[PDB]
RNA sequence: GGCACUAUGGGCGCAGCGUCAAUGACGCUGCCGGUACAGGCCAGACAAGAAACACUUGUCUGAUAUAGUGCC
């Protein structure tokens, strides 16, 4: 039960510059195991990286990262690392270190991981988002309710908030993934479905909310007419 | 060579109950120098099998591995509700290391049609000189469906982009954002901006449209 | 790769010197090439050590091998 790996030091990197992952263990002593970094791009799946070896210290990389990445453990501090070096726009993930198990327990099975830190490169300044109503009307009702929304459009990085009215609308709410657009900016919207007469009775403002920008936007959404 | 890991089905919507097979094939052979993974989203990877048929300590014993050459399959007897996530093949017979490219297992329900709703581009985003025009699909199933932008019955391809939701905790239906983008000039060059949806639960693809400057 | 044929500087002939090459091959002599037992040692294989490689320690293959050719 009492196994822990804690990555630390991730962050923003503009292509071409360097980040060091830390890794963490407690629970066992680092040395007689060997110890990867696993990365996952957003929304992709996992991709294997590195690997350092129990006594021998040899060191595994794979072809995406050859030549650019170090990794490294400290035996004194029980902790791996993973230095990375011209750093690229693919590179941007979240990066696991695991443990692989003891041979007999677990074969080379990876039996604990780190909780990941993100690792996000881009050569995108900080810029808070537009938001542009989606303003409900028809050919935005299908009968008793209405689709109505945000465009949240044009902010980097990730993430935002986005509620409705302060809060207190929830249920039928969708808020999107982000789309990471070609400028290198991310991108999305939110709809929420009401009853449609409720369009003339309740006013419905999107609460869009950019920490890393530090903005804060309402945009009363109202309907189109005629 | 590098090792090559693919898996079969990308995803499975089964429910509750369901006897499920996942089949991961690797280009050469690796012994049984297999491990499996269960990820769930936001969260990190659980070992469920090693050594490609050794149940890991712990996991439930609805899990089991199993090998025939290279082929590896991931079987889980009767389907549980906290199954539903991502599962990994991994080959760790020689450096470098390689992961199948992921299951997603889904919840089996009923066939439901997408409302569709289109929305013109805001008189402020006009302003800004670009025009994004979106459409969404709500709460349908399956997750497969073909959104078609057409600006005066022109096809477009490489000016949308999709988003999708997960899979409804409630409905356990999803939702589908398509956003057209163009220039302010390119979208005063023309009058008429379509949405095709086109979708199992449907009889025939229905779009919805607007003509630039309607009331 | 397997088979069949054929041949067989110790699995470790070197003073070695080169060369390719990033380390085994290759080439070039020169001695010695007699015979066998070696010791020792090395390499491959495997196993275990908290252990993919490396290491340690254990057995095992090193004419059941090695090589040229022929053949599918």
């Known amino acids: 039960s009492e196994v822990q790996l804690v990555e630390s030091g991730g962050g923003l990197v503009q292509p071409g510059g360097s980040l060091r992952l830390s890794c963490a263990a407690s629970?066992?002593?680092?040395?007689?195991?060997?110890i990867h970094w696993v990365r996952q791009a957003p929304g992709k799946g996992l991709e294997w990286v590195a690997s350092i070896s129990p006594y021998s210290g040899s060191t595994y990389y794979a072809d995406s990262v050859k030549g650019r990445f170090t990794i490294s453990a400290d035996t004194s501090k029980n902790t791996a690392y993973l230095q990375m070096n011209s750093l690229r726009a693919e590179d941007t993930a979240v990066y696991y270190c695991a443990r692989q198990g003891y041979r007999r327990r677990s074969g080379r099975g990876f039996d604990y991981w780190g909780q990941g830190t993100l690792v996000t490169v881009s050569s995108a300044s900080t810029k808070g988002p537009s938001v542009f109503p989606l303003a409900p009307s028809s050919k935005s009702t299908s009968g008793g309710t209405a689709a109505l929304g945000c465009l949240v459009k044009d902010y980097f990085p990730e993430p935002v908030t986005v509620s409705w009215n302060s809060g207190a609308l929830t249920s039928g709410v969708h808020t999107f993934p982000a789309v990471l657009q070609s400028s290198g900016l991310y991108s999305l919207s939110s709809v929420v479905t009401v009853p449609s007469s409720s369009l003339g009775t309740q006013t419905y403002i999107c609460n869009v909310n950019h920490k890393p920008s530090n903005t804060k936007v309402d945009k009363k959404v109202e309907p189109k007419s005629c | 060579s590098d090792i090559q890991m693919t898996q079969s089905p990308s995803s499975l919507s089964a429910s509750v109950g369901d006897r499920v097979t996942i089949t991961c094939r690797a280009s050469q052979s690796v012994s049984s120098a297999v491990a499996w993974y269960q990820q769930k989203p936001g969260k990190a990877p659980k070992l469920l099998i090693y050594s490609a048929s050794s149940l890991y300590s712990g996991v439930p014993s609805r899990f089991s591995g199993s090998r025939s050459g290279t082929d590896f399959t991931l079987t889980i007897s009767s389907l549980q509700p906290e199954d539903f996530a991502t599962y990994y093949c991994?080959?760790?017979?020689?450096?470098?290391?390689?992961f199948g490219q992921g299951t997603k297992v889904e919840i089996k329900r009923t066939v439901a049609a997408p409302s569709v709703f289109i929305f013109p581009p805001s008189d402020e985003q006009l302003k800004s000189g670009t025009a994004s025009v979106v459409c969404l699909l709500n709460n349908f199933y399956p997750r497969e469906a073909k959104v078609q932008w057409k600006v005066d019955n022109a096809l477009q391809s490489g000016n949308s982009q999709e988003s999708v939701t997960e899979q409804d905790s409630k409905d356990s239906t999803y939702s589908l954002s398509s956003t057209l983008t163009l220039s302010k000039a390119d979208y005063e060059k023309h009058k008429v901006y379509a949405c095709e949806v086109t979708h199992q639960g449907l009889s025939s693809p229905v779009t919805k449209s607007f003509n630039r400057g309607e009331c």
């Open positions: 629970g066992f002593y680092i040395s007689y195991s060997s």
């Open positions: 991994q080959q760790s017979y020689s450096f470098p290391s390689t």
